[PDB]
Every structure is written in structure tokens, then in C-alpha cells.
A = this chain, B = another copy of it.
Amino acid sequence: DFSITQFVRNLGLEHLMDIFEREQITLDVLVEMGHKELKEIGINAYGHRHKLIKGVERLISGQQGLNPYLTLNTSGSGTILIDLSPDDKEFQSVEEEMQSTVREHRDGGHAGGIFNRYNILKIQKVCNKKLWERYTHRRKEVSEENHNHANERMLFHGSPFVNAIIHKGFDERHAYIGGMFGAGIYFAENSSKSNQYVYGIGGGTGCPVHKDRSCYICHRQLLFCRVTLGKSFLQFSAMKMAHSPPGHHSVTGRPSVNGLALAEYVIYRGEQAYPEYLITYQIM
């Protein structure tokens, strides 16, 4: 609580500090106050409010190249997780999407497990201002191309770094380079397919507590995400591409008799997705 003190002292208004101490005015709060707010807290003289506002301007706009505003406004950022009530239509929608999309896979539950249903424990809406703004800027950009159509889908994603995603967001710099369609972020329309990646690609070592991939005891987590596909390139056979082909914004691998068992989507930029829902569940 000293940047406010230096700022006020430089203006010759140190005698006001007692007020700022009682109302808990820090410099980040002060930079957002005008005549109305300053009058509310007890700065009654017009001259003092004028000096404070002019000083705030000289700091924020007059030295914009230093970006002091971004240094001050680190507070409040971050991710919040809001629990959906089981009795709401949103919870039931997400749960029906989870349940109705289970399919028979080629492996007998070696990667995901042997199951036909899920026991959903909780579903959480992920709220992050900065990530949402990044996603919406990219979506607007993609839509300016592709005749004002974003082509937005809701798709599943499974990975062991879900916390890192919901806090830092999707990053193509952590892309799955060994995938069937190159180094990108992979999404699936069937929850049972994204289940195969929860504890690691191909199930990895299984759950940490039992080393069992088909464990019925340990909790799992999936991400249900907005994905902006834009103009999506249709592919059937594997192709190790580093980026989207020219003119497109994602890749769709469709099922084939000799190819994919189930539909798949791939994006090559981490800001074209947003993990809206975090689902906690057990396999049955």
C-alpha cells in the first residue's frame, strides 16, 4: 500500500491519505474513479478531485508505452469453476450428450475401459475472462473469412493436463505431434473416444492409484469445448501435417471402412477452442 502513497505525495495531496487508508483505496482502484466516485468517498473539494484525475491521466495515458494499466490490473484475473445443479436443464443436456455418445471401440477397453455408461459426479462451467476474449477474437477473425460463419461446434477432449488447459488455455505448443493428422489439438464427437486419452495417450499407465487403465474406482475428467472449425479440410487417410492446409482453419477425419472408426476433428491453433465444461465422472 505504497504506490498510492507515492502517487498522492507527488501531487501534494498527502493530507488526503487518511481517507484513502480507511476506504482501502489502492492505486488500481484510484485509476478507475471519477468525480462521482471521489465525491462519494469524501473528496469534497473540486480542486483535489481535479488533481487526482489529471494525475491518473498523466500516469495511464501519458505513459502508455510502459503499460502501467496492465501492471495494476492483475487482480481479479484467473479461472472460476461454477457447479451446475443436477436438477437444471443444462446439467441434463451435458449429461445426455455424454451418455448418448458412447460407442463400441476397436480395443476391448484397453485404452479407455470396459463400460457402457458413466456415473457423472459433477459438471463445472469454466469462466475465464482473458481466455474467452482470446477465443472470441480468433472466432471473429475466422468468421470475417468464410462468409461470416464461424462453424462453431461443441466437442470432447481428453488429456492428463486438463488443469493446465483450464488455467492457461489450449496451446498448440503442447500439440500431439504423434497424432494421425499431425501436430494439432484433437477433439472427438464421442465421449467414449476422448475417454481413451484421459490418463494418457492410449491410456498410458492408467489411473495413478492402481495403474489400471480400466479402473472403476478413480475419478476422471473430460473437457466439453467450443471449437471454431471455420472452413474444415476433409481427410480420410492419415497425413502428418504441421498446420491446416492453405485456405482452411481445421481438419476433419471422417470414419472409413479401412480408416477411422469414429469422427475426429483437429485444430492447429490453441486459441480456436475454449473448454466450457469440466466433467467429473466414473466409468461403469
Chain A positions within 8 Å of B, measured between CB atoms, are 1-3, 6-7, 10-12, 22-27, 29, 32-33, 37, 40-42, 44-48, 50-51, 54-55, 58-59, 62-63, 65-68, 70-72, 74-85, 87-90, 93-94, 97, 125, 127-129, 132-133, 136-137, 143-149, 151-154, 171-175, 177, 182-183, 224, 226, 231, 241-248, 268, 276-277
Contact = CB atoms under 8 A, between A and B. Distances in A.
B24 A45 contact: yes
29 contacts: A3-B83, A6-B79, A6-B81, A10-B75, A11-B75, A12-B75, A12-B76, A23-B45, A24-B46, A25-B46, A25-B47, A29-B47, A32-B54, A55-B76, A63-B127, A66-B127, A66-B148, A68-B127, A71-B88, A72-B82, A94-B147, A137-B137, A147-B154, A147-B277, A148-B276, A149-B154, A151-B154, A173-B244, A173-B248
A74 B66 contact: no
A38 to B, nearest CB: 10
Given A75-B10, A76-B10, A63 B132 contact: yes
A148 B3 contact: no
B67 A148 contact: yes
B71 A47 contact: no
B59 A80 contact: yes
**Secondary structure type dominating chain A contacts:** mixed
A76 B58 CA distance: 8
A146 B63 contact: no
B48 A173 contact: no
Contacts of A125: 66, 68, 71
A2 to B, nearest CB: 7
Contacts of A51: 29, 75-76
Nearest to A95: B147
